[PDB]
Design a protein around this ligand. Structure first.
Ligand SMILES: O=C(O)C[C@@H](NC(=O)c1ncnc2[nH]ccc12)c1ccc(Br)cc1
Length: 167
């Protein structure tokens, strides 16, 4: 038993809701919240900009130190950093950004990072400003992630569509 509430069950291990991941995070304090990161951990907009804003820019300060030490992530890769006031940990996962021309097949590799964590609150990778089809991101998620994933979908109209087209 865990503390997520109002999610619809899509599969044995994937759940979905219409929620603001920032607000869901501040209420659940999940062990892991997933950031929709880029390779530079520059959290300017989308989910990343919102999560970072909710941390009063502490996420960005920590991220800049990480990059200065380690260099950029790989597309499809991830790193674990602090969750600040939102979670114990933030898993920064880089899905491919279609608006940069990155290979959508890397989306499966991105979701594989979720399997290193028993339970996660996450957005749909490569959705939103990353330019991928969220219905596809959902199919890859379901077919790749084996751990328990609680997906927060900000847009109500999209949430209803994700639901009604799901197989
Ligand atoms: O859910 C959606 O509409 C898709 C969109 N999501 C979010 O912008 C999101 N999601 C959850 N909480 C949030 N608070 C604020 C934004 C937000 C998205 C955009 C870019 C990438 Br890359 C991946 C996903």
């Amino acid at each position: 038993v865990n503390s997520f509430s109002g999610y619809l069950k899509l599969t044995d291990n994937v759940y979905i809701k219409n929620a603001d991941i920032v607000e869901e995070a501040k209420k659940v304090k999940p062990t892991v919240v997933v950031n929709a990161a880029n390779v530079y951990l520059k959290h300017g907009g989308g989910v990343a900009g919102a999560l970072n804003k909710a941390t009063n820019n502490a996420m960005q300060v920590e991220s800049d130190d990480y990059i200065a030490t380690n260099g950029p992530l790989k597309v499809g890769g991830s790193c674990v950093l602090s969750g600040h006031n939102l979670a114990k940990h933030c898993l920064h996962v880089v899905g491919p950004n279609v608006n940069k021309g990155e290979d959508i097949q890397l989306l499966k590799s991105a979701y594989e990072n979720f399997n290193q964590h028993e339970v996660l609150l996450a957005p749909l990778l490569s959705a939103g400003i990353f330019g991928a089809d969220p219905i596809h991101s959902l199919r890859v998620c379901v077919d790749t992630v084996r751990t328990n994933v609680y997906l927060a979908v900000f847009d109500k109209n999209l949430y209803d569509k994700l639901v009604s087209s799901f197989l």
